[PDB]
Design a protein around this ligand. Structure first.
Ligand code: HEM
Ligand code: HEM
Ligand SMILES: CCCCCCCCCCCCCCCC(=O)NCC(=O)O
Ligand SMILES: CCCCCCCCCCCCCCCC(=O)NCC(=O)O
Lengths: 457, 459
C-alpha cells in the first residue's frame, strides 16, 4: 500500500541540506524524527537518503539479503584518513574480508583473557589519579575517560603507551583526531566544499592527518625495534595471513587499520563511560544498586577476568546508557535491488538508508511509554528483547568487531570506579551532548570521595 | 704578615658590576677565583664583599664566635618574596629564633621515619613514569627531578599533592619561582635598579609573587577545610608555640615559611639528583658500583627506611656531586668584631665574606691534584676530611635544616633508579649549567632501559 514519504522543510535549491548546518546534527535529526515519524526523506543537491527510526522498518533494513552496508557522507570524509580500513571499506572491497579474517582472532576469548591485565594496568592509573586529587578539586569526566580508553587500546592493541595520565592537556593525537572528526561533520553541510572559504579548513585537516600518521610511524618503528613476542592486534596486522586469499595485509592497509583501531577502538567507549557515569549520578538508586554489586563481586585488590564477567548489573547499566545515547549514533545501508520497505515505501537499487540509532532505541512499541527513563532493568532478560530493537553495535557481518573488548573494558572500569569512590554531581550538571560524528557529554564534571579501599599491582 | 687582596677589573663608579654581564655569574666568579686565588674583593654601587675560596680562610669564616650569617645581596632580593622566613632572616631577628625552635621538630628522627612512606609514594611515581616510556622516547632529567622533589616536599611538608607527574608543563608555582629567582639574580648586575626602564621587571616580579601566594592560600585552605589533621611542618607552623617566647608564628611569617620551604625544600635537591645522574652516566665504573650496591641492598619490592640507611656508596655519589656542583653555591658571613683573617687580612666589624663553595671544593691542598675527577671514594670515611673542607649545606646554627631530609630523599630515589634501570647518555650530553642563584643542568637527557624488576605497592 504505497505511501508518500514525509520530508522536513526546504531551502530552495539547497533542499534539506541546511538542516545539517549545526554542531548537533544527530540531535537535530532526532527532533525531525519526532515530528515526522518512523521514516523521512532527506534531500541535498545530487543526493537523497532516508532516515529510519522504527524497529518495524529497521528490522528490514537489517536483512543482508536486501541491504548492504553503505558509506554515509560522514564515512566518505572519514575515509580520507582511515582509507579501506575495516570501518570505512565497502563489504565487497578485497581489503574488507581480508582484514576481517586476519584480525577477527585478535578479539577471541583467549585474546580477551590476554588483554585483561593490560586493561587493569590503565584502570589503576585512573583510580590513582582520582585518589591523589586534593580537597578543592573535581574530575573532568569525558577528558579522563578518553585518557583511559585511548591508553587501553594503545597498550592492548599495539603495546604502545600513549601515557595520557602524564599530560594535563589532551594527548596531541586526540587533539588532531577530534579536529579531523569535527571537520568531517562540518563538511556534511557544505554545498560547495571547494569554495576558497574552506582552504584554511583543508590545510588544518591535512596537518591533523599528518599528526595521526606521525604517531602510526612511531607505533610501527617501536614494534620493529623490539620484535619481542607480543601476540596482539599489531602482530596479526604485520604477520597474519588471510585463510581465503593466502595473503597478508599490505603496508598501506596496515596503516589505515592502525588509525582505524586507534579511533574506533576508543572514542565511542570514552563516550559510553561518560554517559554511564552521568546517568548513575542523576539516578542515585541505580548508582547504589550498581555500587553494591561492585562491592560484593570485586573482593580482591584488583579485578580478575572472572570477576568482571560477574558484574551483571554493571552490564545492564552500560546497555541502558547505550540505549539512550549510542555513541556511534548512526549507520547507513543501500538497497541491493529494487525493493519495497515495510509494504509501503518503494526503493530503487542503490537507494540509501540511515538508521537513527537513538530513535530506534526510543521506539514506544518496543520499550513502552517511558523511553527517557534510565532503567537498566530493561535488560533483565536480553533474549526477550525483539530482534533488531537494540543496535548500538551495528548489524550483521559489518557489526562492531570490538564489541566484547569495549564491554569488558567499560564493565571493569565502571566496576572499579563504583568500588573505590562515592560520586557527587557538585554543579548539578545539565546534559550538553557534543557531536563529532560520535556523541559525548561536554563539560561533565563530578567530585569523587574516596572510600579508601587499598588497590593492588 | 698583612696583605692587600686582589680585585678584578673595575668600571669607574660602577665598580665590578659590569664585569659579570652574564646569565652564568657563579661560573664567572669561579674563573676569577682561579686567576686571583683564595680571596678577592668584589664591589658594586653601595656594597663590598670578599670572595673566599680556600679551606684555610673558610675554616676561620665558619667560626661562629667571629662571624654570623649575612644576607648577601642575592638573599636581600630573595627576601622581597620570602620575607623573614628561615632562609632570609638575620640570626638576631626574633622570627628566625621562633621559627627555628618551632620547625626543628619536623626534622626529628621520628619525623624522618614518618616521612619515608610518603617519599616512597613519590619515588614510585617517578619509577612508574620511566617504566612506561616507549623505546623511541627519552627522559628529561632536571624536569623529572623537579617533579619528584616538589611533590615530595608538598606531601611530606604540607599533605598537598602537586601531582607533577600528571602534568606536561611545569606547575605554575615552578614557572613563577624560576622567574622570581632569575629576577633576583639579574638585579645583582643592574646599574640603576630604579631607572623606570625596569618597571616591566617589577610588574612581572609582582605577578610571580602573586602566583606563589595564590598557591600558599590553596595549601592553607586545603588544611583548614579538611578535618583529617596531620602532624607535619604545616601543623607546626599553624599551631606550634615557641618554647622561649611562648608565642606562635604570626600569619605573615607562616606564609613566608611556606614559600621558603617549598623553594628551598625542592630546588636544590632537584639540582643534586640531576648532577648525580649526569656524573653516573659519564663514569660507567662508578655507575656499575652504585648499581651493584642498589641490587644487593634493595631486596624488597619497595625500600624500607633501614635499607636506605645501608646505601653507603649511593650517599658517597651524592656527596661527590655536591663537592663538584653544590647547588646553593654560596653563603655569606659578616664579622661580629674587628678581627684578622688568616693572619693577613684585617677586617672591621660588619665586613662581609662570600663563601664560594664550588671553589672551596676544588682546593688542591685538601683534595689532591685530581679535583675535577668524579671519585666517590673520596668520601669512604668522612671523619678523615678536614674541618670545614666540605660545606654544601652551609654552617653552624644557620646550616641547612633540611640536610637529612634531602639526603634521605635523594638516596632513596637514586637507589631505586639504579635498581630498576640501565642508563644511556644517548646524545653524549655536554654539561650546560643554568643559574637562577641556584645551579642545575639544563637540557640533560638520558635513555633508560628497564631491568624489569617488579615494584611493590606504596607502603
Ligand atoms: C561503546 C563502544 C563502541 C560502539 C558503540 C561501537 C559501535 C560500532 C558501530 C555502530 C559499528 C557499525 C558501523 C557501520 O555500520 O557503519 C562498528 C563497527 C566497528 N567497530 Fe565498533 N563500537 C565500539 C567499540 C569498538 C572498539 C573498542 C573497537 C576496536 C577495538 C571497535 C572497532 C570497530 C570496527 C573495526 C568496526 C568495523 C567492523 C567491520 O565492518 O569490519 N569498536 N562499531
Ligand atoms: C641538596 C639539597 C640542599 C642543599 C645543597 C641545601 C643547601 C643549604 C644551604 C647552603 C643553606 C645555608 C644558606 C646560607 O647560609 O645562606 C641552607 C639553608 C636552609 N635549608 Fe637547605 N639545602 C638543601 C635541601 C633543603 C631541603 C630539602 C630543605 C627543606 C626541607 C631545606 C631548607 C633549608 C632552610 C629552611 C634553610 C635555612 C635554615 C636557617 O638558617 O635557619 N634545605 N640549605
Ligand atoms: C576510523 C574509525 C572512525 C569511526 C567514526 C565513527 C562515526 C560513526 C558515526 C557516524 C554517524 C554520523 C551521522 C551524522 C549525521 C548524518 O545523518 N549524516 C548523513 C551522512 O553522513 O550521509
Ligand atoms: C626562599 C628560599 C631561598 C631560595 C634561594 C636560595 C639561594 C642560594 C644560593 C645563593 C647564591 C648567590 C650567588 C651570588 C653570585 C653573584 O651573582 N654575585 C655577584 C653580585 O653579588 O653582584
Amino acid at each position: 500500500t504505497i505511501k508518500e514519504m514525509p520530508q522536513p522543510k526546504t531551502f530552495g535549491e539547497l533542499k534539506n541540506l541546511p538542516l545539517l548546518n549545526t554542531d548537533k546534527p544527530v540531535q537535530a535529526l532526532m527532533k525531525i524524527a519526532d515530528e515526522l515519524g518512523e521514516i523521512f526523506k532527506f534531500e541535498a543537491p545530487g543526493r537523497v537518503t532516508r532516515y529510519l527510526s522504527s524497529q518495524r522498518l529497521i528490522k528490514e533494513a537489517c536483512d543482508e539479503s536486501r541491504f548492504d552496508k553503505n558509506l554515509s557522507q560522514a564515512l566518505k570524509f572519514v575515509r580520507d584518513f582511515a582509507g579501506d580500513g575495516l570501518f570505512t571499506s565497502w563489504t565487497h572491497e578485497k581489503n574488507w574480508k581480508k582484514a576481517h579474517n586476519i584480525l577477527l582472532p585478535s578479539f577471541s576469548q583467549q585474546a580477551m583473557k590476554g588483554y585483561h591485565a593490560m586493561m587493569v594496568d590503565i584502570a589503576v592509573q585512573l583510580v590513582q589519579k582520582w585518589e591523589r586529587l586534593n580537597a578543592d578539586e573535581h574530575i573532568e569526566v569525558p577528558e579522563d575517560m578518553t585518557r583511559l580508553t585511548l591508553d587501553t587500546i594503545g597498550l592492548c592493541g599495539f603495546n604502545y603507551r600513549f601515557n595520557s595520565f602524564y599530560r594535563d592537556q589532551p594527548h596531541p593525537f586526540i587533539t588532531s583526531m577530534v579536529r579531523a572528526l569535527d571537520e568531517a561533520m562540518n563538511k556534511l553541510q557544505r554545498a560547495n566544499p571547494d569554495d576558497p572559504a574552506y582552504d584554511e579548513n583543508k590545510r588544518q585537516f591535512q596537518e591533523d592527518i599528518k599528526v595521526m600518521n606521525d604517531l602510526v610511524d612511531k607505533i610501527i618503528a617501536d614494534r620493529k625495534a623490539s620484535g619481542e613476542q607480543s601476540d596482539d592486534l599489531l602482530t596479526h596486522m604485520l604477520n597474519g595471513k588471510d585463510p581465503e586469499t593466502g595473503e597478508p595485509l599490505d603496508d598501506e592497509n596496515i596503516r589505515y587499520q592502525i588509525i582505524t583501531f586507534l579511533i574506533a577502538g576508543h572514542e565511542t567507549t570514552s563516550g559510553l563511560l561518560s554517559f554511564a557515569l552521568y546517568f548513575l549520578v542523576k539516578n542515585p538508586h541505580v548508582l547504589q544498586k550498581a555500587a553494591e554489586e561492585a562491592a560484593r563481586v570485586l573482593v580482591d585488590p584488583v579485578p580478575s577476568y572472572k570477576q568482571v564477567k560477574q558484574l551483571k548489573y554493571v552490564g545492564m547499566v552500560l546497555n541502558e546508557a547505550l540505549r539512550l545515547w549510542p555513541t556511534a549514533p548512526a549507520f547507513s545501508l543501500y538497497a541491493k535491488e529494487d525493493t519495497v520497505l515495510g509494504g509501503e515505501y518503494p526503493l530503487e537499487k542503490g537507494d540509501e538508508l540511515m538508521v537513527l540509532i537513538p530513535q530506534l532505541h526510543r521506539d514506544k512499541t518496543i520499550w513502552g511509554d517511558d523511553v527517557e527513563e534510565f532503567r537498566p532493568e530493561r535488560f533483565e532478560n536480553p533474549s526477550a528483547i525483539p530482534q533488531h530493537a537494540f543496535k548500538p553495535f551495528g548489524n550483521g557481518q559489518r557489526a562492531c568487531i570490538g564489541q566484547q573488548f569495549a564491554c569488558h573494558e567499560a564493565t571493569l572500569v565502571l566496576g572499579m570506579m563504583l568500588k573505590h569512590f562515592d560520586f557527587e554531581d557538585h554543579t548539578n550538571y545539565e546534559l550538553d551532548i557534543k557531536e563529532t560524528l560520535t556523541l559525548k557529554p561536554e563539560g561533565f564534571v563530578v567530585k569523587a570521595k574516596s572510600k579508601k579501599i587499598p588497590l593492588g599491582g
